[PDB]
Structures are given as structure tokens and as C-alpha cells.
Amino acid sequence: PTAAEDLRHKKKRLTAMERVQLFCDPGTFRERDALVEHECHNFGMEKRKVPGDGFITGTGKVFGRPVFLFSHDFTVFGGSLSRTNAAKVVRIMEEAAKIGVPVIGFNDSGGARIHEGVDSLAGYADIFLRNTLFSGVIPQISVIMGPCAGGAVYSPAITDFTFMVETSSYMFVTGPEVVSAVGGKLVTKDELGGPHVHATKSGVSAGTFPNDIVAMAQLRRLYSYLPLSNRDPVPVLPTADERYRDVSSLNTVVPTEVKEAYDMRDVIYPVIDHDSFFEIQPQFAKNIICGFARVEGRSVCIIANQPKVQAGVLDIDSSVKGARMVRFADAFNIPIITFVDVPGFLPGVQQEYGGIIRHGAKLLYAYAEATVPKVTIITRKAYGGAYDVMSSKHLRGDSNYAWPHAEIAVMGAAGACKLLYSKETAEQQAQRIADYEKTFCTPLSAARKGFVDAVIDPSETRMRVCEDLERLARKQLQNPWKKHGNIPL
Amino acid sequence: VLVANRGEIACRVMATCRRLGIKTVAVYSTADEQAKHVKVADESVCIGPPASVESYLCIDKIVDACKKTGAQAVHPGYGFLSENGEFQSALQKNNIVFVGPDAHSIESMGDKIESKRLAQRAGVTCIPGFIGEVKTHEDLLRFAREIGYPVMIKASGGGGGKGMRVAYNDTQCVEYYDMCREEAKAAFHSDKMLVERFIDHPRHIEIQVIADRRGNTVYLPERECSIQRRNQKVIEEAPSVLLDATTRKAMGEEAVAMARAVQYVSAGTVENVVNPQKQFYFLEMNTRLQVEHPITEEITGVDLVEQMLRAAADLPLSITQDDITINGHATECRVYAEDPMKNYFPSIGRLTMYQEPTGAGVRCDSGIIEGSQISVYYDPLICKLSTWGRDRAECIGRMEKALDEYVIRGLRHNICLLRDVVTEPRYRSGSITTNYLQEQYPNGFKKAELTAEEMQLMYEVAACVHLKRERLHYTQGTAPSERQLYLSVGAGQEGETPVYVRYLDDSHFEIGASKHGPFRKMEVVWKASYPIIRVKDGEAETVLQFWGTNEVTYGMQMRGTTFDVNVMSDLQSTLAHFVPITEATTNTKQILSPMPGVIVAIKVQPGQMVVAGEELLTLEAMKMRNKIHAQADGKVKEVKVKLGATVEDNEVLVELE
Ligand SMILES: O=CCCCC[C@@H]1SC[C@@H]2NC(=O)N[C@@H]21
């Protein structure tokens, strides 16, 4: 019996129920509500009632841990929401708020249902309010499998992570018809809101998958990292890997020349456990890396610069990416580990015309507000305000480390030499820049002041990180009483 | 003593001293501050920039540096400027030991010419043939019949293989002489031809020699260097199959006789060419310390390093030809960073992501430790894998097994070629030739495929690994123990093979066709997220490797080759048919610079060939030199952006057409 799904598969596409079956465990899905009708009675809609009413909501179970989910249905009315569709979603989110369980939704709606009038707006508003209230209480993940237009786009935005499917998905606020009507330009749906556009240009989508099957397979892996609720502790899984594994290849990663580049992944991979990195937003703002990883069987958060791309310089997009990652990680009590290599901020008129001052402050706010244990490692250099922003010791950092060839200075040697000698005799470059770099572009001064705990061999990083992360397991820090902060938007 | 090399041999020397209780010193270049031989040494001194000239080749630095160690002797090594006069002269200026042969023998034998003179000095069965011009076809036929050889027609003034044709009969002799005279008159202005005993099919047998400054000269057992690519050898073996004492004893005696002839001290080695009729040809003799001796040392125990350093002090050896014997045979291979399947593309500048050497009853000499890199201006050799044995089958099987346990990550290599060559039944037949490689690899290189049972075993191991890694993620006792998987390699699911699994213990399963099917109870032992995977069904034993996965596709290595097996359940299998398979853009067009900057260095030339992975140029921006390369293409048609063109802004630096 394979009835009524032949029409769907013929278009090389899967069904909502099949997606739900693929996500959860083999036999642990219990559909909650299945016999519900729209009761519209307008515009010749009194007929063609549907039992499911276009939504599939259940409970399910992943890796032995509970979950909640819902999936849109494209065959029935195009997946449009109504006064009645939104009730099921509201009930699921409320139940997942009472119990410490997350929510995952597979969006496929074609837009609002016009035949209901303003009831669709009512349902949208209720879903928006539930998302707003419960953000930071239970993790929310959203996946977009098909078209997603109109005002329905906003609820995925408030969710913590949004993923996209490559061939047959798109998302935008207004359709290309209106764009043609007002501006006069003919742009296709994919050219407007395709997965690539949101992966590279707008920065909304947190990832892209080639197929639905791969999407489910990796969504399970992502779910294996998250904590169940706000009050539950960070999960710890058994692992045969051990902190005594030898990592001596880190002694040679940093080149002896100051103008040559290297890949920061060569430093990230040895420290964490084998094959346990899940990069977030891999194709957007490549000069910074963010993602999840495990250290001795417990999930941690990774944020590191990359001198491979644009000399590892902070920017607007990198600031937004890092700020969102830090805020989410702190909201759910996940340790943060950072690797620092920054020469400063990206210079340019477009930057000031785009508001670098606002955006660069977001990362600093996220780092200063955080109360989870932090570990910082300075590999090569840290200059100016970039050193302050990237989790400096003064921002209530727990432990800070440096490598023997690091440099921590106010600015580059040339600018310091220029400002320290206004009209000093010519040729001052040769006998002053070298001396200043020798005397003050070294971690000795910063260690004398007390800004780094110790200068360590690069081969001891795994040992030190495991020791510190084990000791810091029970830190309790609290901020002054506030209704909420006022972050620079 | 101080060494002069920076490869595996240097480590070997600083290792022989262990027993000899000899403190050692090792110099290095700037790039090699993290080489193993630096830390293995007792003392280290820098020799300037790592370019070859200043590095080690800078005699002045080296000889000058030889004034602080106190060492009364200094090894000459085997590479770089080893056994050199300009160097021997300098070391005898400061009156220090050379730990090597004497000058007169070295210049008398390593010289390109007059080697034939020493050869014919006592004849020593040197190249045979009519020594003179053949002015008539009658003379050519008569001298061909004299020895009935394949003629070996070669020009008197020609060299390098030009003007040579192989004649098997008299008519072939006449026709090939007619072609040879026409070729040589145009190419080398000489019509003078010579006829010599051509070899049916060569084996390039090599005979080892050792000696001493006092006496007790000994002949070491011979070796093999038949396999050769681009005049570089790959696989070696000391006791070749075509070994008769009638020849071999005379080979050793004649090698020793030639030794005292030029009063050679530190013998290099003797070269020969051998036909199925058991001949020998002493010429192309070597005067350098060949490092293929590990094989001989495995069949003898004759520590060449110890004996030569002992002879460097004017003492006789500790061994005589009377006790030298054979305890089996050994196989040795060389591991290159040369990517064979990709047109022998060189892969350099890649530190070892992570590597582990095979150490099961085998020997490995290498200078590349974990976290080490290979520059372009050096030898791309990785390791020198040699395994002891007594029987061909025994020694080979060992190599087979030892090849699969060599984990190399971070750069390519030629291990697949070595594996395929060893596994070939032609190689295990017993005899080979010097044209063996290109004879068995006509068009490029193509690795041999898998039989049905091997692919089935790979499927079974993949299913076991999938289940073992799956059980890790589950919490407490809420974990499964049995599934039914559908494995199919390839993007089109070629050969869907249903598989079961039961996981009766930690490292035991009950693999079968499906439910209610007979079970076999194999065994797999693998640490999560690690490379090596040991699996043993009954007696058979296999070792596979685990590269990575994306939870639907598994990257597993079988017989030194990468595959991507798909492990999916019933639902995933039945649904993967209804999935779009888009084709990525195949654009052969101009390449643009991603970001603004300055071009300071260029690598490729305008309108010539380009291959994948080749660096093209280097922009420098905000104090940082990048290096955009050629992802993949055959050639280009474009106009180069000149040096110092601070324009960029996503311009067309190179245009591919
Ligand atoms: O010396 C002149 C240019 C130096 C720029 C150095 C890098 S570029 C972006 C960042 N901003 C700075 O002031 N320094 C760094």
C-alpha cells in the first residue's frame, strides 16, 4: 500500500510523514492530533474538509531522549496556516515549555490562507509570541524543506538555528511579482531567496544540505550535542579518547615568518576529540570559525580566527556571527574555548558607512555578559581593541594562555615608532622599529603585567584545556539584577 | 663525529653510535629546526638559509663549523657533497678524518670516462662486441653470429639511447644497420657503428662490496634493483631468485679482486646486467654509500656503518667472508610524496596531519616525524620500509600487511602503486625485468579492482563499524543491538546487498544475510574515530582504515584505496531513489582574485600547461601573502598581471581557455 504519495514522489520530493519517520527513532513517534477540520465557511470552502488539516505534530524520541516536532504538508492547501493549524503548534510549544524538551519544525508553508481572513494573522501572532517568550528556555531548531514566503518567514528567524535544503527551498518576505511591479526588475525566485543567497549574502541560514536524507542524518548528530533544557546540565558522552594522547605536531604549525599564513584548523583539530567538529555557517564570513565540539566527552563551543582569509581581521559579519554564537552558548551553560589571532579591524569607508561601531560592539557585549567558563589561547598576535574584544582576561576570563612566539601590543611597530618620534632624524625606521618590536612586541611585557596566566609549550594545550575545563565544572557567577540588558542592536 | 646529511641516514648514524658509544653532532638549516635528527643529536648547529646551496652544500660553513665539537672524525654522509675532493681537500687542510674512501680511488672510478679502462684493465667480463667499425654488412652478420646476440646496434658517437636498434637475425641486422646509419649520419655526423651482445631482458643485478684499509676484504651478498621508473628504483631484494653459486662465488671473488685494484677503501657497490643465461658485467660501478644495505643487513647482520667507521681509524674489520651466510631474504620499498594516479603530480608543503608507522616485526627508517613537512627543494621521500623474511611468500605477505597499517594523512603518496605491484601475480611468479613497470602500466596508472569476496568483507566490516559507532551516542541502557542495513557503493546504488548485525559482545558480531539467515560470528576491533581496523574471520585477517563520514556515507580504505560505502536502512534505501542529483558547474574559464591586494610573486607562465593543485601566484595584503592555485584544468590562454600591480579588485589575473 503506497497510495496518494505517488503524485508527490513523481516530482522528486518527499512527504512530511516520511521526513518525520526518518528523523526520529524507528518506532517511537506518537502522532498527537490527527482528526481536525478548518471550520471556515467562506468563499466556497465549506466543502473539501481535510482530516489532518495540513499539519503533523507528535512527540517522537531521538537517541533515547525526548523531542517535540511538527511538519507542514504541501499537498493539503499548500501548507497555509489558519486559526486551527496554529492551535496545534501552540499546544506543542506550551507543553514543551512545561517540560524541559526542545522543539524542531520542518517548514513548508506556501503562505497564509486567504480564505480565513485575519485569523491567519492571529495564528501567526500567537506563534511569534510563543517563540519570543520561550527563546532561551528550550533550544529551537528550524529546517526549511520547501517554499517559505510571506510573513511566515519571521518565526524561523527568531529560532536559534535555521538550515536549508539545496535544490527545492527558498525564503523571502516579498515575492518577485511585487518587485517587478514597483522597481521593474525581473528576478527569479531562486535568484531572490535561494539557499546560496542566504548562505553567503544575508547570513540568515546556518547551513545547507544536499538532500533531505542527509539533512535528517546530520540533524540527529547536531541534536546529540544540545542540552535538553535551560536548567539541565551539559550532556557528557562516553568516549575512548583520552587527554594523554600525544599532540606534538602543534610545535610546528606557526611559521617562523610573520607574513606567512596558516590554517587555524590545524590548531583546532588536535585539541578536540577525533571527528567531533560541527561547523556553523561554513560559507559566510570565512575569516572566523564557529561551531560545536567535544573535549573529553563533553560538548563545548569553539570560536577562532583564521589568518587564511583576509589576515584574520574582524569585520561586521564576523562580529554578528560570533555574537550570536556566544549568546546561544552562554544561554544554555556551554563552555567556550577561543583561539586568538587578529591584527585589528578591517579599514574602509564602506565599513563606517555601514556601522562598524554598532556591530563590533555586539561581540564585546556577548563576551563580557557571559558567565560560563572561558578558556583563551593567544597563538601569534593580538593588537588594539581586537585584543580586548576577543575574551581578554579583564572581562572576567577564567584562564588565559599564550604561545612562546606571541605578540601583544597596542598597535603595529610602524605606527608606534611614528607617534613616539614626531620629527626625529631620518632613517629612524631601521634602528627604531626593530628595537621596539624586539622590546615590546613579545608576551614578556603582558606576562609581567599579569594579563596571561602562563606561557606554555604548544604541546601542552590539550592537557591544560582538559584540566581547566574539568576544574571549572561548578562555577557559579551572577550579574546584577536586571529586567533584561540593552544590547546595541 | 658529525654527519653531513639531513635524511634518514643521519638518524641511522646517530643511532649506530648508541651501541658504539659515540657522541654525535648534527647540523641543520633554518627550516629543519624541528627535524627529528636535530633532537636525536647531542649537538646541533645552524647552517643558514634552507635553500640547498647554503644548507649543507655550503662547505665553507660546514668545514668552518667543524671546529667546536672536538670530534676527531666527521661522517661524510651519503648525499649532498659526500665523498667530494673539494671537500676532501678542505678536510685535510684542517687535518681531520673523512670517514670515507681515499681520493685516488674515488676519482679513478666515479669518473665518467676511463672507467672502461679500469674495466678492461683486467677485462673482468666487460661489455662484449666487435671493438671497431663495421664497414660492411658481411662483417655485421659475421660478428652477430659470433655470439648470436641481439646485436645491440649502437652508434660510436651516439649516447643516451639514440641510434640503437635491436637485431635478432641477419635480415634484421641488415635492415637495422641501414636505418642506424641513416639516423646517425644526420644526428651525430658519424656513420661508425658498433655491434655488441644485447641483453634479451635485463634484471640489473647489483653486487655489494665492503673492504678495509688494512685487509680482510669481504664480499657482501648481491642485491636487486630491477624495478625502475624514470631511472629511479622502487623495490629491492638482496638474494635474487636467479642465484647460482657457480656465478655468485666468482662474483664475490672478482669484486674483491677489483677492490684492491684501485686500492678502494670505502667500497660503494658493483653494478651488473644479468640475462637468463647467467652472465655478469662489471661496470657503472658505484663509489657512494648505498642505503639499500638494510636488506643485506637483514640477510647478514653486517653493520656497514660500524665497520666503515672502524676502518676510518686504520683498523681491520670484525667480519670475514667465512662467516657471512644467508638467513632468508628481505624486501625494501621507498615511499614518495609523488601522486601517481594523478599523472605523478608532486604534493609538497603539507605537514603530516597525523601519521603512524607500521611496526609489527618490521623495520622503518625515516626522517619525517609527526608534524613534519616537505619543501620543494629537497627529496620528497617519506619512509624507507623494509621487512625481514626468509621466504618470498613469507616476506611479501608481511609487506602486504605492513603497507595497510601505514597511516599517512595530510598529503598524497604512492603506496597504492607499491601495493598493486606487490599483489600482482606476475611479481609473485618469481622473475621480473627492468621494463616491468611500463610493460604492466601502458596508459598512465590504474589500480587493480576488488573481487566479490573482498567487497563483501568490506561491506560486512562497514556495517559492523556503523553499528559500533551508533551504540556510542545512545544514553545508558536504552540502546539497540540489531539492525538490517542495505549497503551499496556508488552514486547509483550498484548491487544492493542486505546485511544484518547483532553485536553479541564488545568486539563480536553475528553478521548474516538477513533475519532468519545463517550467521558467521566474525570479529572487528576498532577504537572510535581512529584509522586502523583489524578484522579476522576464521584464519583470514584484514586491516582496513576509516577516513570519515557524513552519517550516510562512510569513507573506508580497502587495499590502499579510498571508497565511499553507503550504509542505510530500509526507509533510506527506498527513499534515496526519489532524490534530485544535480550536476555541479563545469566551467573552464578565467580565474579571478577573491580579494584586493598586491601581486609580489608569480609561479606559472603565460599560455602553457597547468595541472590541479599548482600554485599560480601570491598576493600580499595587509601584511600577509596568500597563494591562489589552480583547482583543476589542463591549460591556459591569458595575459599575466605584472609584478607589483596593486590593482586586484576581483580582476582577471589568469584566464583559463
Ligand atoms: O601599515 C599600514 C597598514 C597596516 C594594516 C594592518 C592591519 S590591516 C587591518 C587592521 N587595521 C589596522 O590598523 N591594522 C590591521
JSON list of C-alpha atoms in Angstrom, two decimals, chain B residues 10-144:
[
{"chain": "B", "resi": 10, "resn": "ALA", "atom": "CA", "xyz": [71.61, 10.89, 9.54]},
{"chain": "B", "resi": 11, "resn": "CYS", "atom": "CA", "xyz": [69.24, 9.35, 12.06]},
{"chain": "B", "resi": 12, "resn": "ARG", "atom": "CA", "xyz": [70.72, 5.94, 11.31]},
{"chain": "B", "resi": 13, "resn": "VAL", "atom": "CA", "xyz": [74.20, 7.20, 12.08]},
{"chain": "B", "resi": 14, "resn": "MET", "atom": "CA", "xyz": [73.17, 8.93, 15.29]},
{"chain": "B", "resi": 15, "resn": "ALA", "atom": "CA", "xyz": [71.64, 5.56, 16.11]},
{"chain": "B", "resi": 16, "resn": "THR", "atom": "CA", "xyz": [74.60, 3.31, 15.34]},
{"chain": "B", "resi": 17, "resn": "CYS", "atom": "CA", "xyz": [76.57, 5.38, 17.84]},
{"chain": "B", "resi": 18, "resn": "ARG", "atom": "CA", "xyz": [74.19, 4.21, 20.56]},
{"chain": "B", "resi": 19, "resn": "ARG", "atom": "CA", "xyz": [75.96, 0.86, 20.74]},
{"chain": "B", "resi": 20, "resn": "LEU", "atom": "CA", "xyz": [79.29, 2.33, 19.61]},
{"chain": "B", "resi": 21, "resn": "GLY", "atom": "CA", "xyz": [79.00, 4.80, 22.48]},
{"chain": "B", "resi": 22, "resn": "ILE", "atom": "CA", "xyz": [79.95, 7.67, 20.20]},
{"chain": "B", "resi": 23, "resn": "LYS", "atom": "CA", "xyz": [78.72, 11.19, 20.90]},
{"chain": "B", "resi": 24, "resn": "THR", "atom": "CA", "xyz": [77.27, 12.68, 17.74]},
{"chain": "B", "resi": 25, "resn": "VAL", "atom": "CA", "xyz": [76.66, 16.16, 16.33]},
{"chain": "B", "resi": 26, "resn": "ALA", "atom": "CA", "xyz": [74.10, 17.09, 13.68]},
{"chain": "B", "resi": 27, "resn": "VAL", "atom": "CA", "xyz": [73.90, 20.35, 11.73]},
{"chain": "B", "resi": 28, "resn": "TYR", "atom": "CA", "xyz": [70.69, 21.71, 10.24]},
{"chain": "B", "resi": 29, "resn": "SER", "atom": "CA", "xyz": [69.17, 24.50, 8.18]},
{"chain": "B", "resi": 30, "resn": "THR", "atom": "CA", "xyz": [66.61, 27.02, 9.41]},
{"chain": "B", "resi": 31, "resn": "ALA", "atom": "CA", "xyz": [63.58, 25.18, 8.03]},
{"chain": "B", "resi": 32, "resn": "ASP", "atom": "CA", "xyz": [64.76, 21.94, 9.70]},
{"chain": "B", "resi": 33, "resn": "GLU", "atom": "CA", "xyz": [64.74, 23.26, 13.28]},
{"chain": "B", "resi": 34, "resn": "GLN", "atom": "CA", "xyz": [62.07, 20.65, 14.08]},
{"chain": "B", "resi": 35, "resn": "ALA", "atom": "CA", "xyz": [63.51, 17.67, 12.20]},
{"chain": "B", "resi": 36, "resn": "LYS", "atom": "CA", "xyz": [63.96, 14.54, 14.28]},
{"chain": "B", "resi": 37, "resn": "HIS", "atom": "CA", "xyz": [67.70, 14.26, 13.64]},
{"chain": "B", "resi": 38, "resn": "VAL", "atom": "CA", "xyz": [68.15, 17.61, 15.38]},
{"chain": "B", "resi": 39, "resn": "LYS", "atom": "CA", "xyz": [66.68, 16.30, 18.64]},
{"chain": "B", "resi": 40, "resn": "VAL", "atom": "CA", "xyz": [68.24, 12.86, 18.25]},
{"chain": "B", "resi": 41, "resn": "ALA", "atom": "CA", "xyz": [71.64, 14.52, 18.04]},
{"chain": "B", "resi": 42, "resn": "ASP", "atom": "CA", "xyz": [73.71, 15.54, 21.04]},
{"chain": "B", "resi": 43, "resn": "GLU", "atom": "CA", "xyz": [74.70, 18.81, 19.40]},
{"chain": "B", "resi": 44, "resn": "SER", "atom": "CA", "xyz": [73.15, 20.97, 16.68]},
{"chain": "B", "resi": 45, "resn": "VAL", "atom": "CA", "xyz": [74.45, 23.98, 14.74]},
{"chain": "B", "resi": 46, "resn": "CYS", "atom": "CA", "xyz": [72.62, 26.12, 12.20]},
{"chain": "B", "resi": 47, "resn": "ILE", "atom": "CA", "xyz": [73.89, 26.31, 8.61]},
{"chain": "B", "resi": 48, "resn": "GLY", "atom": "CA", "xyz": [71.95, 29.31, 7.36]},
{"chain": "B", "resi": 49, "resn": "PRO", "atom": "CA", "xyz": [69.03, 29.53, 4.96]},
{"chain": "B", "resi": 50, "resn": "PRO", "atom": "CA", "xyz": [67.34, 26.28, 3.91]},
{"chain": "B", "resi": 51, "resn": "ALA", "atom": "CA", "xyz": [67.87, 26.67, 0.18]},
{"chain": "B", "resi": 52, "resn": "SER", "atom": "CA", "xyz": [70.07, 23.77, -0.91]},
{"chain": "B", "resi": 53, "resn": "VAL", "atom": "CA", "xyz": [73.19, 25.86, -1.58]},
{"chain": "B", "resi": 54, "resn": "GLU", "atom": "CA", "xyz": [73.53, 27.40, 1.89]},
{"chain": "B", "resi": 55, "resn": "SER", "atom": "CA", "xyz": [72.04, 24.33, 3.51]},
{"chain": "B", "resi": 56, "resn": "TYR", "atom": "CA", "xyz": [74.74, 21.67, 3.96]},
{"chain": "B", "resi": 57, "resn": "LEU", "atom": "CA", "xyz": [76.07, 22.43, 0.48]},
{"chain": "B", "resi": 58, "resn": "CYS", "atom": "CA", "xyz": [77.79, 25.48, 1.96]},
{"chain": "B", "resi": 59, "resn": "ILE", "atom": "CA", "xyz": [81.08, 23.69, 2.51]},
{"chain": "B", "resi": 60, "resn": "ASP", "atom": "CA", "xyz": [82.65, 26.84, 3.94]},
{"chain": "B", "resi": 61, "resn": "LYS", "atom": "CA", "xyz": [80.06, 26.96, 6.69]},
{"chain": "B", "resi": 62, "resn": "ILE", "atom": "CA", "xyz": [80.24, 23.21, 7.23]},
{"chain": "B", "resi": 63, "resn": "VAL", "atom": "CA", "xyz": [84.03, 22.90, 7.31]},
{"chain": "B", "resi": 64, "resn": "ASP", "atom": "CA", "xyz": [84.33, 26.03, 9.42]},
{"chain": "B", "resi": 65, "resn": "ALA", "atom": "CA", "xyz": [81.68, 24.68, 11.77]},
{"chain": "B", "resi": 66, "resn": "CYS", "atom": "CA", "xyz": [83.92, 21.66, 12.18]},
{"chain": "B", "resi": 67, "resn": "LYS", "atom": "CA", "xyz": [86.00, 23.42, 14.83]},
{"chain": "B", "resi": 68, "resn": "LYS", "atom": "CA", "xyz": [83.98, 23.31, 18.05]},
{"chain": "B", "resi": 69, "resn": "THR", "atom": "CA", "xyz": [82.67, 19.78, 18.54]},
{"chain": "B", "resi": 70, "resn": "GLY", "atom": "CA", "xyz": [86.11, 18.35, 19.25]},
{"chain": "B", "resi": 71, "resn": "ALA", "atom": "CA", "xyz": [85.02, 15.20, 17.45]},
{"chain": "B", "resi": 72, "resn": "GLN", "atom": "CA", "xyz": [88.16, 13.61, 16.00]},
{"chain": "B", "resi": 73, "resn": "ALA", "atom": "CA", "xyz": [86.18, 12.45, 12.97]},
{"chain": "B", "resi": 74, "resn": "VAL", "atom": "CA", "xyz": [83.21, 13.64, 10.93]},
{"chain": "B", "resi": 75, "resn": "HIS", "atom": "CA", "xyz": [80.90, 11.47, 8.82]},
{"chain": "B", "resi": 76, "resn": "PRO", "atom": "CA", "xyz": [80.67, 12.43, 5.14]},
{"chain": "B", "resi": 77, "resn": "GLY", "atom": "CA", "xyz": [77.12, 11.10, 4.85]},
{"chain": "B", "resi": 78, "resn": "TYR", "atom": "CA", "xyz": [75.92, 9.66, 1.55]},
{"chain": "B", "resi": 79, "resn": "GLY", "atom": "CA", "xyz": [74.15, 12.56, -0.15]},
{"chain": "B", "resi": 80, "resn": "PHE", "atom": "CA", "xyz": [74.88, 16.23, -0.80]},
{"chain": "B", "resi": 81, "resn": "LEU", "atom": "CA", "xyz": [78.63, 16.70, -1.12]},
{"chain": "B", "resi": 82, "resn": "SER", "atom": "CA", "xyz": [79.60, 13.30, 0.28]},
{"chain": "B", "resi": 83, "resn": "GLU", "atom": "CA", "xyz": [82.85, 11.77, -0.98]},
{"chain": "B", "resi": 84, "resn": "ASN", "atom": "CA", "xyz": [83.96, 15.01, -2.63]},
{"chain": "B", "resi": 85, "resn": "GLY", "atom": "CA", "xyz": [87.51, 16.14, -3.32]},
{"chain": "B", "resi": 86, "resn": "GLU", "atom": "CA", "xyz": [86.95, 19.87, -2.96]},
{"chain": "B", "resi": 87, "resn": "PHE", "atom": "CA", "xyz": [85.60, 18.66, 0.35]},
{"chain": "B", "resi": 88, "resn": "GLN", "atom": "CA", "xyz": [88.27, 16.01, 0.99]},
{"chain": "B", "resi": 89, "resn": "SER", "atom": "CA", "xyz": [90.90, 18.66, 0.26]},
{"chain": "B", "resi": 90, "resn": "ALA", "atom": "CA", "xyz": [89.34, 21.10, 2.73]},
{"chain": "B", "resi": 91, "resn": "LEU", "atom": "CA", "xyz": [89.07, 18.50, 5.48]},
{"chain": "B", "resi": 92, "resn": "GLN", "atom": "CA", "xyz": [92.72, 17.51, 5.02]},
{"chain": "B", "resi": 93, "resn": "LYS", "atom": "CA", "xyz": [93.64, 21.20, 5.15]},
{"chain": "B", "resi": 94, "resn": "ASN", "atom": "CA", "xyz": [92.45, 21.24, 8.77]},
{"chain": "B", "resi": 95, "resn": "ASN", "atom": "CA", "xyz": [93.75, 17.66, 9.18]},
{"chain": "B", "resi": 96, "resn": "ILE", "atom": "CA", "xyz": [90.58, 15.74, 10.05]},
{"chain": "B", "resi": 97, "resn": "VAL", "atom": "CA", "xyz": [89.22, 12.27, 9.23]},
{"chain": "B", "resi": 98, "resn": "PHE", "atom": "CA", "xyz": [86.87, 11.78, 6.28]},
{"chain": "B", "resi": 99, "resn": "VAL", "atom": "CA", "xyz": [85.21, 8.55, 7.37]},
{"chain": "B", "resi": 100, "resn": "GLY", "atom": "CA", "xyz": [85.24, 7.58, 3.70]},
{"chain": "B", "resi": 101, "resn": "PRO", "atom": "CA", "xyz": [87.26, 6.30, 0.72]},
{"chain": "B", "resi": 102, "resn": "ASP", "atom": "CA", "xyz": [90.57, 7.71, -0.46]},
{"chain": "B", "resi": 103, "resn": "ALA", "atom": "CA", "xyz": [90.68, 10.31, -3.21]},
{"chain": "B", "resi": 104, "resn": "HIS", "atom": "CA", "xyz": [92.62, 8.38, -5.86]},
{"chain": "B", "resi": 105, "resn": "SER", "atom": "CA", "xyz": [90.14, 5.50, -5.98]},
{"chain": "B", "resi": 106, "resn": "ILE", "atom": "CA", "xyz": [87.15, 7.87, -5.93]},
{"chain": "B", "resi": 107, "resn": "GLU", "atom": "CA", "xyz": [88.31, 9.96, -8.89]},
{"chain": "B", "resi": 108, "resn": "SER", "atom": "CA", "xyz": [89.60, 6.85, -10.69]},
{"chain": "B", "resi": 109, "resn": "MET", "atom": "CA", "xyz": [86.28, 5.01, -10.52]},
{"chain": "B", "resi": 110, "resn": "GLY", "atom": "CA", "xyz": [83.46, 7.55, -10.17]},
{"chain": "B", "resi": 111, "resn": "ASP", "atom": "CA", "xyz": [84.77, 9.41, -13.21]},
{"chain": "B", "resi": 112, "resn": "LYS", "atom": "CA", "xyz": [82.58, 9.11, -16.30]},
{"chain": "B", "resi": 113, "resn": "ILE", "atom": "CA", "xyz": [85.44, 8.09, -18.61]},
{"chain": "B", "resi": 114, "resn": "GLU", "atom": "CA", "xyz": [88.48, 5.83, -18.05]},
{"chain": "B", "resi": 115, "resn": "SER", "atom": "CA", "xyz": [86.11, 3.59, -16.11]},
{"chain": "B", "resi": 116, "resn": "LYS", "atom": "CA", "xyz": [86.15, 1.38, -19.20]},
{"chain": "B", "resi": 117, "resn": "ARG", "atom": "CA", "xyz": [89.95, 1.41, -18.91]},
{"chain": "B", "resi": 118, "resn": "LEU", "atom": "CA", "xyz": [89.88, 0.03, -15.39]},
{"chain": "B", "resi": 119, "resn": "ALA", "atom": "CA", "xyz": [87.19, -2.33, -16.66]},
{"chain": "B", "resi": 120, "resn": "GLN", "atom": "CA", "xyz": [89.39, -3.63, -19.46]},
{"chain": "B", "resi": 121, "resn": "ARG", "atom": "CA", "xyz": [92.45, -3.32, -17.25]},
{"chain": "B", "resi": 122, "resn": "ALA", "atom": "CA", "xyz": [91.68, -6.88, -16.25]},
{"chain": "B", "resi": 123, "resn": "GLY", "atom": "CA", "xyz": [88.77, -7.22, -18.65]},
{"chain": "B", "resi": 124, "resn": "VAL", "atom": "CA", "xyz": [86.54, -8.54, -15.89]},
{"chain": "B", "resi": 125, "resn": "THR", "atom": "CA", "xyz": [83.93, -9.67, -18.43]},
{"chain": "B", "resi": 126, "resn": "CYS", "atom": "CA", "xyz": [83.18, -6.16, -19.65]},
{"chain": "B", "resi": 127, "resn": "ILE", "atom": "CA", "xyz": [80.73, -5.35, -22.44]},
{"chain": "B", "resi": 128, "resn": "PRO", "atom": "CA", "xyz": [81.37, -7.76, -25.33]},
{"chain": "B", "resi": 129, "resn": "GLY", "atom": "CA", "xyz": [81.22, -6.95, -29.02]},
{"chain": "B", "resi": 130, "resn": "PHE", "atom": "CA", "xyz": [83.33, -6.29, -32.09]},
{"chain": "B", "resi": 131, "resn": "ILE", "atom": "CA", "xyz": [85.59, -3.45, -30.94]},
{"chain": "B", "resi": 132, "resn": "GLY", "atom": "CA", "xyz": [85.69, -1.35, -34.09]},
{"chain": "B", "resi": 133, "resn": "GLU", "atom": "CA", "xyz": [83.79, -0.04, -37.08]},
{"chain": "B", "resi": 134, "resn": "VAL", "atom": "CA", "xyz": [81.66, -2.45, -39.11]},
{"chain": "B", "resi": 135, "resn": "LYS", "atom": "CA", "xyz": [82.16, -1.16, -42.66]},
{"chain": "B", "resi": 136, "resn": "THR", "atom": "CA", "xyz": [80.20, -3.92, -44.43]},
{"chain": "B", "resi": 137, "resn": "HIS", "atom": "CA", "xyz": [77.01, -5.90, -43.90]},
{"chain": "B", "resi": 138, "resn": "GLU", "atom": "CA", "xyz": [79.02, -9.13, -44.13]},
{"chain": "B", "resi": 139, "resn": "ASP", "atom": "CA", "xyz": [81.09, -8.12, -41.10]},
{"chain": "B", "resi": 140, "resn": "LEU", "atom": "CA", "xyz": [77.93, -7.20, -39.19]},
{"chain": "B", "resi": 141, "resn": "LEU", "atom": "CA", "xyz": [76.34, -10.59, -39.87]},
{"chain": "B", "resi": 142, "resn": "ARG", "atom": "CA", "xyz": [79.55, -12.47, -39.06]},
{"chain": "B", "resi": 143, "resn": "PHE", "atom": "CA", "xyz": [80.03, -10.66, -35.75]},
{"chain": "B", "resi": 144, "resn": "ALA", "atom": "CA", "xyz": [76.34, -11.07, -34.89]}
]
